Amino acid sequence: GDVEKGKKIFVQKCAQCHTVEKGGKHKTGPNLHGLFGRKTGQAPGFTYTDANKNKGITWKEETLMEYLENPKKYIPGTKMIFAGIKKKTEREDLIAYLKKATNE
Numbered sequence: 001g002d003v004e005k006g007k008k009i010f011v012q013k014c015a016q017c018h019t020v021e022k023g024g025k026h027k028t029g030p031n032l033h034g035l036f037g038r039k040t041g042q043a044p045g046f047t048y049t050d051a052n053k054n055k056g057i058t059w060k061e062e063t064l065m066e067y068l069e070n071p072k073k074y075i076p077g078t079k080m081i082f083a084g085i086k087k088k089t090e091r092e093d094l095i096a097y098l099k100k101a102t103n104e
């Protein structure tokens, strides 16, 4: 993906509820630093729904590609409000940006 476009997408569609920087505060949603290779529902200090807490998957590109297309469908009962990113290219860009920034 295009990391720069991914950043734009993050700023426009995710930043209002999430941070990606280390020690960034929990907002409406959990901080996403260290997201890749981590199980669902594990950010310490965030109170998840039971659905998100017990989804039982590992966040990585494949799982993010599916989630971000339609969060509700992938984790029914999530309290995250997001319709989904319908275009594959934009999803890849965002995911590529998150892969960089959440490990940075």
Ligand code: HEC
Residues within 6 Å of the ligand: 010, 013, 014, 015, 016, 017, 018, 028, 029, 030, 035, 039, 040, 041, 042, 043, 047, 048, 049, 051, 052, 053, 059, 068, 077, 078, 079, 080, 081, 082, 094
């Ligand atoms: C508020 C309006 C949000 C927007 C916009 C986005 N997210 Fe979100 N996200 C939000 C909440 C409240 C939660 C917790 C959900 C629950 O049911 O407990 C989430 C959760 C996630 C997760 C899962 C993280 C985990 O630790 O398991 C991810 C990966 C995530 N959110 C990513 C994400 C992205 C990439 C967004 C923009 C594309 C985005 N979210 C928007 C609240 C909100």
